[PDB]
Short mmCIF file of C-alpha atoms in Angstrom, two decimals:
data_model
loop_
_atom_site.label_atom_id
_atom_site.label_comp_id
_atom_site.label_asym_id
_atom_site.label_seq_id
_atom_site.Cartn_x
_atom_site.Cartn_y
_atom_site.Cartn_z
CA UNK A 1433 9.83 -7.67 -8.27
CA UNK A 1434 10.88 -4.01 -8.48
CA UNK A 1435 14.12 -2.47 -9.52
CA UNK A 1436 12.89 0.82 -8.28
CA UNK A 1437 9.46 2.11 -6.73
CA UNK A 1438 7.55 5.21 -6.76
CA UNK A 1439 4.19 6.30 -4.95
CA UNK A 1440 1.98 9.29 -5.85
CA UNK A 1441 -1.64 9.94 -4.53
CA UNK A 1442 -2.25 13.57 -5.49
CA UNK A 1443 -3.30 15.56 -8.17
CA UNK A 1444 -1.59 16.05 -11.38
CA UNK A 1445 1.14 13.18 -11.11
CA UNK A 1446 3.97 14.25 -12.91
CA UNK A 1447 3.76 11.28 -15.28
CA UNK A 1448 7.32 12.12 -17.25
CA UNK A 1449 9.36 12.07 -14.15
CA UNK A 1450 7.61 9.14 -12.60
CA UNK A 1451 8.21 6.64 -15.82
CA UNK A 1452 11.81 6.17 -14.48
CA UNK A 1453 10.37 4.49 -12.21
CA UNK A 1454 10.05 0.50 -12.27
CA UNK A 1455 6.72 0.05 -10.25
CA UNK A 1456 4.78 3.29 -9.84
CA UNK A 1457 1.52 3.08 -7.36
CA UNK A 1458 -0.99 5.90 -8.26
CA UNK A 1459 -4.39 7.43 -6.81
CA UNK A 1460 -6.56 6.38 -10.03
CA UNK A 1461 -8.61 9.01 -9.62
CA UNK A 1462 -6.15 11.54 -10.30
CA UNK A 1463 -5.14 10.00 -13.92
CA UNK A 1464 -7.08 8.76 -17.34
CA UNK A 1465 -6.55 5.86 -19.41
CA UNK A 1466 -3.95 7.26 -21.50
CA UNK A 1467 -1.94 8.19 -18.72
CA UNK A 1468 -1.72 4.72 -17.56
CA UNK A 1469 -0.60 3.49 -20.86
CA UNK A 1470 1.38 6.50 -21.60
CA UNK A 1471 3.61 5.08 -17.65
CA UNK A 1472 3.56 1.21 -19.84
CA UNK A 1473 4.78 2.68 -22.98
CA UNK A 1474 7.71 4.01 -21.29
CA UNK A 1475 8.62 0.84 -19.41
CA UNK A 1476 6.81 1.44 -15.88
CA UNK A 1477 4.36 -0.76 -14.15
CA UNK A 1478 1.30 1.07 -13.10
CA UNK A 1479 -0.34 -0.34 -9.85
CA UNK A 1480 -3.81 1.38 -8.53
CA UNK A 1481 -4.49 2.22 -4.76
CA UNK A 1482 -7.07 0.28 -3.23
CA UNK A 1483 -8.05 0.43 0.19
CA UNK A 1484 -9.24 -3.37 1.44
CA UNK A 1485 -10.08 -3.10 4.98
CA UNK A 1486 -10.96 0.74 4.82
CA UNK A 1487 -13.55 3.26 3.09
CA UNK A 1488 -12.17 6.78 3.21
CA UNK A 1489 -15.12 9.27 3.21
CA UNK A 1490 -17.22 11.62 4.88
CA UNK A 1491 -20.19 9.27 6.73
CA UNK A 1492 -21.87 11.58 3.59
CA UNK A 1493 -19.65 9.70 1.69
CA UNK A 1494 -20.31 6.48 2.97
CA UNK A 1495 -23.93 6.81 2.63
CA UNK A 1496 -23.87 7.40 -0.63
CA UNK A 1497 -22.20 4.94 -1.82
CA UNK A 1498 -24.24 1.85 -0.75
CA UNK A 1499 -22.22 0.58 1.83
CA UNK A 1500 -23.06 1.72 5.20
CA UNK A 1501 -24.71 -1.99 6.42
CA UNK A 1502 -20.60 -3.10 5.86
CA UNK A 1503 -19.11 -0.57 8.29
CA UNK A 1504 -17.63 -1.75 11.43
CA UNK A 1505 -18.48 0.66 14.13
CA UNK A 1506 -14.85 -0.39 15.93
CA UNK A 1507 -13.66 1.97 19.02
CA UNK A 1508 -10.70 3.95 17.64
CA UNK A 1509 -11.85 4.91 14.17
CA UNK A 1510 -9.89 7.37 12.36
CA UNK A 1511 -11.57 10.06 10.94
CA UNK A 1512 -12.47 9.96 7.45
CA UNK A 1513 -11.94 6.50 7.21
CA UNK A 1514 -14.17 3.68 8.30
CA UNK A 1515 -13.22 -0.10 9.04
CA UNK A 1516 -15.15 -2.36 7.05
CA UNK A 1517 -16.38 -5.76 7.76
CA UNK A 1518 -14.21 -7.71 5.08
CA UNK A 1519 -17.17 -10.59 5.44
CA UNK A 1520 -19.91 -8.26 4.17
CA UNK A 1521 -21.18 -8.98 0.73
CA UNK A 1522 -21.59 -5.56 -0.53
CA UNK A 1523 -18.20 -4.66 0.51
CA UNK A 1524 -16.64 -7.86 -0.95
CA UNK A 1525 -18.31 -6.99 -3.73
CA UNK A 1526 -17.58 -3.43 -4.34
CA UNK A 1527 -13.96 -4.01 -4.06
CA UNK A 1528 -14.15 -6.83 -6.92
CA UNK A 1529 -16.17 -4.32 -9.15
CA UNK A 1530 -13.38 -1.65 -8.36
CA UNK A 1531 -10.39 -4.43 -9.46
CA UNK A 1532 -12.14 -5.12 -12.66
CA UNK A 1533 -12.76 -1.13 -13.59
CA UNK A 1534 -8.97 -0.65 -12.89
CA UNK A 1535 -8.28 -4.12 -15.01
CA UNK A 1536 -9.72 -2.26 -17.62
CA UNK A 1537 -8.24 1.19 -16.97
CA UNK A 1538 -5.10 -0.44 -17.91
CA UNK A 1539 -3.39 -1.09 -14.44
CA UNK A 1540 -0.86 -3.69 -14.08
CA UNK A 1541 -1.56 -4.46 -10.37
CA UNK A 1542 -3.09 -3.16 -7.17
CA UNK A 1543 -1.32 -1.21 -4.47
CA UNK A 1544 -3.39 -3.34 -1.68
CA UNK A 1545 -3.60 -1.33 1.37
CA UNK A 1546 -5.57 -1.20 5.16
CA UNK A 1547 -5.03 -5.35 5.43
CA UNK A 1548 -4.24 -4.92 9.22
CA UNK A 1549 -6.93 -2.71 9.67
CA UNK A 1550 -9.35 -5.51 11.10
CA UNK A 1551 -6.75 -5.43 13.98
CA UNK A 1552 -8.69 -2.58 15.34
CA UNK A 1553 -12.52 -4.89 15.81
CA UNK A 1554 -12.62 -6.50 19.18
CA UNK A 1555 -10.43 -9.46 20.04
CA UNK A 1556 -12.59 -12.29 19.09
CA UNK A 1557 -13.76 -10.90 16.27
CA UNK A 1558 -10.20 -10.83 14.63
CA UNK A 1559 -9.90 -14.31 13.47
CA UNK A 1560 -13.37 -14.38 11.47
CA UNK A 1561 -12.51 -10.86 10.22
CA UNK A 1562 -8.41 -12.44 8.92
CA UNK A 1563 -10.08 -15.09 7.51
CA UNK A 1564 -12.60 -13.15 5.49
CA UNK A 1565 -9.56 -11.04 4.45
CA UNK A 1566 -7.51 -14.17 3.42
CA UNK A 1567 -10.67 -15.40 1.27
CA UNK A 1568 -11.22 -11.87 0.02
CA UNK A 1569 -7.76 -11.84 -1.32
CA UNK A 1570 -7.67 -15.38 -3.18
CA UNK A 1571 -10.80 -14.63 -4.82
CA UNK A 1572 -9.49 -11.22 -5.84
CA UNK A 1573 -6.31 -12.81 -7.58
CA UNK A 1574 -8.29 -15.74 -8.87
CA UNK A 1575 -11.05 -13.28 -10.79
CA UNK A 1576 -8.32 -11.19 -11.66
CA UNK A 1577 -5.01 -12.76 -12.58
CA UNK A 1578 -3.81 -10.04 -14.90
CA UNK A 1579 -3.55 -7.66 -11.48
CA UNK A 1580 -0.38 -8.09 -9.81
CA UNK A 1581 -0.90 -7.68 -6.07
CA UNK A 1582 1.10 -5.56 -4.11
CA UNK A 1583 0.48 -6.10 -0.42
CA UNK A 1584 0.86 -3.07 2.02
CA UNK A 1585 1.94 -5.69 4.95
CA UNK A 1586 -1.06 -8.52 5.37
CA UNK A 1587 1.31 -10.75 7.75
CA UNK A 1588 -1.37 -12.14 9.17
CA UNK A 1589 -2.92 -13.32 5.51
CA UNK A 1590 0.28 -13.94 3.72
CA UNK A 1591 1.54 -17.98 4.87
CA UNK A 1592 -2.24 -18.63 3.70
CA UNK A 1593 -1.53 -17.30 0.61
CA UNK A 1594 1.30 -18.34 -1.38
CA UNK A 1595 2.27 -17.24 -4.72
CA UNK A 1596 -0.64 -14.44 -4.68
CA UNK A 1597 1.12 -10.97 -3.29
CA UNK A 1598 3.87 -10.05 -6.11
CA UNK A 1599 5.82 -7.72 -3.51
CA UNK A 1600 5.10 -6.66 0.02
CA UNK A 1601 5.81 -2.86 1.40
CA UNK A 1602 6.26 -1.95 4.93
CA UNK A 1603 6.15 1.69 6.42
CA UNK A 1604 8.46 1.81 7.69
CA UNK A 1605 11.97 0.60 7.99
CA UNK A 1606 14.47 3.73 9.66
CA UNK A 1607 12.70 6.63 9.11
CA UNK A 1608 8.59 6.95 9.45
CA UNK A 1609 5.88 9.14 9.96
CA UNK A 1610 4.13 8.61 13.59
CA UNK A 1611 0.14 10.19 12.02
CA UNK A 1612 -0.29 10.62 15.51
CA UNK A 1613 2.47 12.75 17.07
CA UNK A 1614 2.15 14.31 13.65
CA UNK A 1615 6.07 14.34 13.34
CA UNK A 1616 8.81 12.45 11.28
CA UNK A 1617 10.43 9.98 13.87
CA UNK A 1618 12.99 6.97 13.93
CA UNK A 1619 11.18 3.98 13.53
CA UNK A 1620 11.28 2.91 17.15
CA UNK A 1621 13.53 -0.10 17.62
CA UNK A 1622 10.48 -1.93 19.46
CA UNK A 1623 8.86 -1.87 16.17
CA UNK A 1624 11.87 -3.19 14.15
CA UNK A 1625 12.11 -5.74 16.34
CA UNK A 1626 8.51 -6.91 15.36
CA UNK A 1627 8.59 -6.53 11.93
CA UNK A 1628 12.05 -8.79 11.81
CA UNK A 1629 10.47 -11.85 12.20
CA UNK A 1630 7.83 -11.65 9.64
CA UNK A 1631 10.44 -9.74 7.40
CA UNK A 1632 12.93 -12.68 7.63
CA UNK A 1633 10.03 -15.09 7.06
CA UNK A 1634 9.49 -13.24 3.35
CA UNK A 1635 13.01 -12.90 2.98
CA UNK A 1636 13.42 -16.78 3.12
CA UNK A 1637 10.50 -17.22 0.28
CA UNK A 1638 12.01 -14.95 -2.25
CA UNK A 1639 9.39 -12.10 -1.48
CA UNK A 1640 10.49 -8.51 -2.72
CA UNK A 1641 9.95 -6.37 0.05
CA UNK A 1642 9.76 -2.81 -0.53
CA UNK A 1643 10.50 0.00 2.42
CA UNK A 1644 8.42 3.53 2.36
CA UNK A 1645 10.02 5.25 4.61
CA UNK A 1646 9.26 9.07 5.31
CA UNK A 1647 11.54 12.22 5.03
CA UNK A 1648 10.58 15.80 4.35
CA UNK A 1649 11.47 17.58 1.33
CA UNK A 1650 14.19 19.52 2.90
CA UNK A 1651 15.93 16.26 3.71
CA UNK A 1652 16.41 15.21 0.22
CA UNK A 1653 20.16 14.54 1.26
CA UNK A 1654 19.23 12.45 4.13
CA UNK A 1655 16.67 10.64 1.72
CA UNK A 1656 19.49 9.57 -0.77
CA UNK A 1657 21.24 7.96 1.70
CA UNK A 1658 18.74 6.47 3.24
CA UNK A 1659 17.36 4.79 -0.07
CA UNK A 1660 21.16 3.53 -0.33
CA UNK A 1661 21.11 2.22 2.73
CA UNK A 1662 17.56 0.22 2.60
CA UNK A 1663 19.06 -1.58 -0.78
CA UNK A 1664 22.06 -2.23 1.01
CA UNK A 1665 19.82 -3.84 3.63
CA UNK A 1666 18.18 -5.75 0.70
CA UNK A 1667 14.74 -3.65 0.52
CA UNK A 1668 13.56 -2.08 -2.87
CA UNK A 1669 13.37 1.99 -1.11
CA UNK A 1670 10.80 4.98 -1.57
CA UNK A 1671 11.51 7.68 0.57
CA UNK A 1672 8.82 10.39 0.28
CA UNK A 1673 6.41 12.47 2.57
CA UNK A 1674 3.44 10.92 4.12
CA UNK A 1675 1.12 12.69 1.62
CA UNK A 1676 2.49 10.74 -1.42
CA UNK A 1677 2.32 14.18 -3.13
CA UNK A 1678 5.96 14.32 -4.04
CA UNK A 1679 9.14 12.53 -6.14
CA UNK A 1680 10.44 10.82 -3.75
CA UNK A 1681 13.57 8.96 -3.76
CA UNK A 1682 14.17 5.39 -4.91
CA UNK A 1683 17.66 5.43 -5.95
CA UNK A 1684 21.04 7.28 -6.04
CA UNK A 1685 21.81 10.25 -8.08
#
């Protein structure tokens, strides 16, 4: 897996500074082709975001894109973002046709992201929806074995499918961002206490596990430590701001 990890989603990625980097996930549509091989010259691994269980857009957005019949209408929605059902064929689809235009962009993997989303559909739709996920995903890494995978969480998919995810990240470890309460908080230790279990499970297999934890800019201090003590703790660390929009820390100085 990864020495050391970066994540940018904005504009203008400052492509220099983020080649130190080992593994470097990117918004695609903030960079060109030559940026991407410009990261591989220098020795990074370029992975593209790619939201599986989500479409973010406007219901304009949506709409325009062909996909509305695949939108799960599920009861706490966030805004700007709509749960899709992962057994609809036009969603299926689009994501497949997205892999192979990033295959051909030049990206080493996928940053694979919203695969606990379908948590949010009614109770006894859940198992047809984690199944359809766990299908999704082997036929993703069997049309496209050049993409390394790199699961945001997918707990529930992962014993299904071994040797498919080449890392797995978890927001977030100590520090975190509750989108909610809008504020940086401690990862409460309810929440540690159910990630352990799945967390030693990966541990066991070999997985790398990679924590993105959440700091502000002014606590770049706090951040340094923090990263030291996540690879102390035996996670690969990327401590940034919930926007992804700055060079975060992976490492010590």
């Amino acid at each position: 897996g990864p020495s050391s990890v970066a994540f940018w989603y904005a504009e203008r990625p400052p492509l220099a500074e983020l080649s130190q980097f080992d593994w470097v996930v990117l918004e695609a549509a903030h960079l060109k082709p030559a940026d991407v091989g410009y990261l591989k010259e220098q020795g990074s691994t370029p992975f593209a975001y790619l939201s599986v269980g989500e479409f973010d857009g406007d219901a304009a957005a949506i709409a325009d894109s062909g996909l509305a019949r695949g939108k799960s209408a599920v009861r706490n929605q966030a805004w700007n973002s709509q749960v899709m059902d992962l057994a609809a064929p036009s969603w299926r689809a689009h994501l497949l046709k997205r892999a192979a235009e990033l295959r051909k962009q030049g990206y080493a993997g996928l940053f694979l992201d919203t695969l606990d989303s379908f948590q949010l559909q009614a109770e006894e739709r859940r198992e047809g929806q984690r199944r359809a996920l766990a299908s999704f995903l082997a036929q993703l890494h069997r049309q496209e074995p050049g993409l390394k995978l790199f699961f945001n969480r997918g707990f529930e998919v992962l014993p299904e499918l071994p040797g498919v995810a080449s890392a797995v990240a978890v927001e977030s470890i100590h520090a975190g961002w509750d989108a909610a309460a809008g504020q940086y908080r401690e990862v409460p230790q309810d929440d540690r206490d159910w990630l352990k279990g799945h967390l030693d499970a990966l541990r066991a297999q070999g997985m790398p596990i990679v924590a993105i934890d959440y700091l502000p800019p002014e606590r770049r201090d706090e951040a340094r430590a923090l990263a030291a003590r996540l690879r102390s703790e035996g996670y690969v660390p990327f401590v940034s701001t919930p926007a992804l929009d700055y060079l975060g820390v992976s490492d010590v100085e």
